[PDB]
């Protein structure tokens, strides 16, 4: 199999300005008939894959100008003259030269941004979830950028580990943030035997970390 | 335009089988290379296989043969996709596609079919336990509803009958230890409105014929 493999992964571009988007195979994607079969697309959030160029340089119809394509033997280049709220989404290379045909991994271009804070909420489990014998602990990190933050559990000010699960939003087209959740799961033994539940926040947005709390029962 | 239509949400045990169609509504079928090409639920695409109609010539990811057929009917226009021995690993999107013509022509297209999700569990239908995110006691208050252990995906969420949509935010649902899945909604609203606003998640849960409207109050 011929191995794609595309720098960077995340890709943040600042509207209007140039993006660049490499794909290296690990042999030469030149056919016997002469042709190179390396073909760039975009998925756009929620689509499949659309055809932006084929064969290295060509480009597809009714596929905007601003993007092109050059290389090759194993190395090719996608640019974008000037990015879009449109551009967004995950670029794939592909190659059809070998059987089996083969994808890069993708490559996420995302809409940069200054830094933005989340606003931070805390949760607790509701009762009706009480009488389950699970107890749930929501934190939300609300509208921020970028999408790296560093969410800590503290109980009783004693820090959690692998007791959490997060879940991330796709970047909001109209504002280019992001929110994330982190659900704090507790049998309902272990939650009813502590008081200080907190979710504290790390984030470029926060010269400090911010902490938000609740004490059980009041 | 040309394009394809696939057959609907597949939920599968592991050791099952499987058999998804995809439909030209355009065109001659007998002339088309189609590809079957699987999205892995974070992650890249994986090549399946190719079929040409016409000759009936098949060429099969290595990985896949033997799991894998690829048939057509000549007769009605469609594709077919069989899969045996199901995996928990052949959890995927499932695309039909037509990108290449015959080589040497110079002739390509982008048709995608909208995509047939496989999902493989030995999970059982559940409905969703949807549980309260309160807002607690300055200008703008968060509040949401936990959508929790339900199976398979998806589940829908609205505000407010569709009424409310401005910040609101679903998250994606997230694969539990348990089999289960596991999701929050959240929209935030001004402080202001609590009083003298109510908030109602509307979920629904077709593959259980679950619906559940929540009402989310404050403490």
């Known amino acids: 199999d011929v191995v794609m493999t595309q720098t960077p992964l995340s890709l943040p571009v600042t509207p209007g300005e140039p993006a660049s988007i490499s794909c290296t195979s690990g042999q030469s994607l030149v056919h016997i008939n002469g042709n190179t079969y390396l073909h760039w697309y975009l998925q756009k959030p929620g689509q499949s894959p659309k055809l932006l160029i084929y064969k290295v340089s060509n480009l597809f119809s009714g596929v905007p100008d601003r993007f092109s394509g050059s290389g090759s033997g194993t190395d090719f280049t996608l640019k974008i003259s000037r990015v879009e709220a449109e551009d967004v989404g995950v670029y794939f290379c592909?190659?059809?030269?070998?059987?089996?045909?083969?994808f890069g991994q993708g490559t996420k271009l995302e809409i940069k941004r200054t830094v933005a804070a989340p606003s931070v909420f805390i949760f607790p489990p509701s009762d009706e979830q009480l009488k389950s014998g699970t107890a749930s602990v929501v934190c939300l990190l609300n509208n921020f950028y970028p999408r790296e933050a560093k969410v800590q559990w503290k109980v009783d000010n004693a820090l959690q580990s692998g007791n959490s699960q997060e879940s991330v939003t796709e970047q909001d087209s109209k504002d280019s943030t992001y929110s994330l959740s982190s659900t704090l799961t507790l049998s309902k033994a272990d939650y009813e035997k502590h008081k200080v539940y907190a979710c504290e926040v790390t984030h470029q947005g926060l010269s400090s970390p911010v902490t938000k709390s609740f004490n059980r029962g009041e | 335009e040309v394009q394809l239509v696939q057959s609907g949400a597949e939920v599968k045990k592991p050791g099952e089988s499987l058999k998804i169609s995809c439909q030209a509504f355009?065109?001659?079928?007998?002339?088309?290379?189609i590809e079957w090409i699987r999205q892995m639920p974070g992650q890249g695409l994986e090549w399946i296989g190719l079929i040409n109609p016409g000759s009936d010539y098949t060429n099969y990811n290595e990985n896949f043969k033997g799991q894998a057929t690829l048939s057509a009917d000549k007769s009605s226009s469609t594709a077919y996709l069989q899969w045996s021995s199901l995996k928990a690993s052949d959890t995927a999107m499932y695309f039909c596609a037509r990108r290449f013509g015959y080589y040497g022509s110079g002739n390509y297209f982008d048709y995608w079919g909208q995509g047939t999700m496989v999902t493989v569990s030995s999970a059982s239908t559940k409905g969703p336990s949807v549980f309260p995110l309160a807002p607690s006691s300055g200008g703008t208050a968060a509040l949401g509803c936990l959508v929790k252990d339900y199976f398979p995906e998806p589940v829908t969420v609205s505000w407010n009958s569709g009424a409310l949509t401005s910040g609101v935010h679903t998250f994606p649902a997230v694969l539990q230890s348990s089999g289960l899945y596991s999701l929050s909604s959240v929209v935030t609203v001004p402080s202001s409105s609590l009083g003298t606003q109510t908030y109602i998640c509307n979920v629904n849960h077709k593959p259980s014929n679950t619906k559940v409207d929540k009402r989310v109050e404050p403490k």
């Open positions: 592909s190659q059809s030269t070998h059987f089996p045909f083969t």
């Open positions: 355009g065109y001659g079928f007998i002339n088309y290379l």
